[PDB]
Each structure stands twice: as structure tokens, then as C-alpha cells.
Amino acid sequence: AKINFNEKLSQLQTYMIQFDQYIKDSYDLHDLKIAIANIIDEIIEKLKSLDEHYHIRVNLVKTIHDLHLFIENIDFNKSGSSTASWIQNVDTKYQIRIQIQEKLQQLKRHIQNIDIQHLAGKLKQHIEAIDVRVLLDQLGTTIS
């Protein structure tokens, strides 16, 4: 029984060492990230080329600006529910609608800063930043 246990334990230790080796050597996923980033950059170039040829982003920025201006322009002075007009005017003399318009304009500027190129760049940053090989090395040197 002692011999059987010793043989089995030595075999299990050898299997664990081989498993660590296999973990270390199995890193083919790392190849994918670089290719994904490359294609993302290619498409960033392509998209910016297309926009420069068809005014898509200029028109979209104008659309966003005008939509936020319309949201700003909504007047509650004329609105029904008479108290609405009174509250609106009391706000008018307390620059509260000015604060509402400032918030709307800040949101408008931020949204107009949300660009397809920015999204692609952030996605490429996320893909390239992490390396699976570091995680594999950590796994092979911790669990034992």
C-alpha cells in the first residue's frame, strides 16, 4: 500500500508539473488581440476617410446641437397647469433655467464629443492593454 501511494503521488506531482508547463506554453490567444487592433485601426482610417467624403459627422453634430437647443427652448411659461407658468417665471428670475440650459449644453458638447473614431480607439486600447501571457505566467506560478 505504501508503494502504491508513493507511486501515485509521484505520478500526480509529475502531472501537475506538466500541467504548469502546458499552461505556460498555451498562449495562442495573444496572437488574436494584435490582429483585432490592426483591423480596428484600419477601420478607423476607413471611417474617417468616408466621413470626410460625405459630411456625415458635420451633419450629425449639427443635428445633436439643434436637438439639444430644442430641448432647451421648451417654454413652460405658456404651458397649461397655471402653476407651471408661475414656477417657470419664479425660476426665470432665479436663473434656474440658466442652470438647466448649462447642463443641457454641457451634455450636448459631451455627446458631440462621442465619436465613432473615439469608440474604436478606446476598444483598441482595451484589446491591446491586456496580455493573456502575463495571466498564464501568474497561473503557472501560483496554483501548485
The DSSP symbol for 77 reads: S
Q: Identify the experimental approach.
A: cryo-EM
Q: Is the separation of the CB atoms in 64 and 70 below 8 Å?
A: no
Look at residues 75, 65, 73, 76 and name the one whose alpha carbon lies nearest to residue 106.
Answer: 65
Q: Is the separation of the CB atoms in 29 and 136 below 8 Å?
A: no
Look at residues 136, 120, 142 and name the one whose alpha carbon lies nearest to residue 39.
Answer: 120
Q: For this experimental structure, what is the resolution in angstroms? A: 9.0
Compute the CA torsion angle 83, 85, 89, 94 (nearest 10 deg). Answer: 60
Q: How far is CA 94 from the centre of its chain?
A: 38
Distances 84 to 32, 63, 72, 92, 95 between C-alpha atoms, Å: 59, 29, 16, 12, 16
For residue 104, give every residue at least 6 positions away whose Cβ sits within 8 Å of its Cβ, in sequence order, or none. Answer: 68, 71, 72
